[PDB]
Design an enzyme around this catalytic site. Sequence first.
Site, PDB file in Angstrom:
ATOM      1  N   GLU A  87      45.821  35.094  36.312  1.00  0.00           N
ATOM      2  CA  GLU A  87      46.688  36.257  36.472  1.00  0.00           C
ATOM      3  C   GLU A  87      48.122  35.830  36.756  1.00  0.00           C
ATOM      4  OE1 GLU A  87      45.609  38.852  35.454  1.00  0.00           O
ATOM      5  OE2 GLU A  87      43.601  39.390  36.166  1.00  0.00           O
TER       6      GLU A  87
HETATM    7  N1  LIG Z   1      37.075  35.065  34.048  1.00  0.00           N
HETATM    8  C1  LIG Z   1      38.512  35.236  34.154  1.00  0.00           C
HETATM    9  O1  LIG Z   1      39.246  34.309  34.112  1.00  0.00           O
HETATM   10  C2  LIG Z   1      39.107  36.621  34.311  1.00  0.00           C
HETATM   11  C3  LIG Z   1      38.330  37.656  34.699  1.00  0.00           C
HETATM   12  C4  LIG Z   1      38.875  38.885  34.832  1.00  0.00           C
HETATM   13  C5  LIG Z   1      40.224  39.063  34.567  1.00  0.00           C
HETATM   14  N2  LIG Z   1      40.993  38.018  34.179  1.00  0.00           N
HETATM   15  C6  LIG Z   1      40.453  36.792  34.049  1.00  0.00           C
END
Ligand SMILES: NC(=O)c1cccnc1
Length: 246
Positions: A161
């Site tokens: 993120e």
């Molecule tokens: N598995 C991940 O890296 C993930 C999960 C949910 C949102 N963004 C990334």
Amino acid sequence: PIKFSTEGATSQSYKQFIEALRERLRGGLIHDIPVLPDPTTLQERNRYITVELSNSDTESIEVGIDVTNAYVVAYRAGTQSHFLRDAPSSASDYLFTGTDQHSLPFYGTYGDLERWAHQSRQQIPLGLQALTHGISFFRSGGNDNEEKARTLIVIIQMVAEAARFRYISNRVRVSIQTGTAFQPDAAMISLENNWDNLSRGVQESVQDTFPNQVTLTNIRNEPVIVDSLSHPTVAVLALMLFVCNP
Ligand SMILES: NC(=O)c1cccnc1
């Protein structure tokens, strides 16, 4: 192998880590905003990258990341690796192939991770100490699936993120600079929940107008309508999911 150490970490060392990750993930630019590679024209041999997260020279793990969506799909501790339940089938052909690979019991989504952690993102602290704790837990090989899920929620937000959103990478920077853990605010959560929405709006836009309006939530729980490239909140997008070419 892109690396981040928690030992004596600074706002600057973390920023440089996220910058290096963003540089490796960028597949191109759309409307001057970086976008991940189109999965359909990407060679599988270029699809998966590793990031090393270390607490010291003797304690480190690796996370495997899918460059098509910046998802953490697996992690490695020594000779043993663990893949999310919904990892792409090809992930285990390229990541941690020299380990004993195992399938985790939960999907890599916030929905399932939060279910297994018995905590929401809003309840799970982020920052250098949470990451340090998680690195040690994965390297220890403890089988507590609840803590496995919580630990992934931490790593995902501080790595993936943060790569996607300048707002989030900066917030984590502030945490390391001030040595003060934090829980994700409604703004941070809303961005996470609308990454594909924002990407689609940008890339499907016509005369700087999103085909469909994206509704974000700001710091004070108020809705913020986003339907154009000029919208201030659009500046926080560092990496977009590929949706379509102009
Ligand atoms: N598995 C991940 O890296 C993930 C999960 C949910 C949102 N963004 C990334």
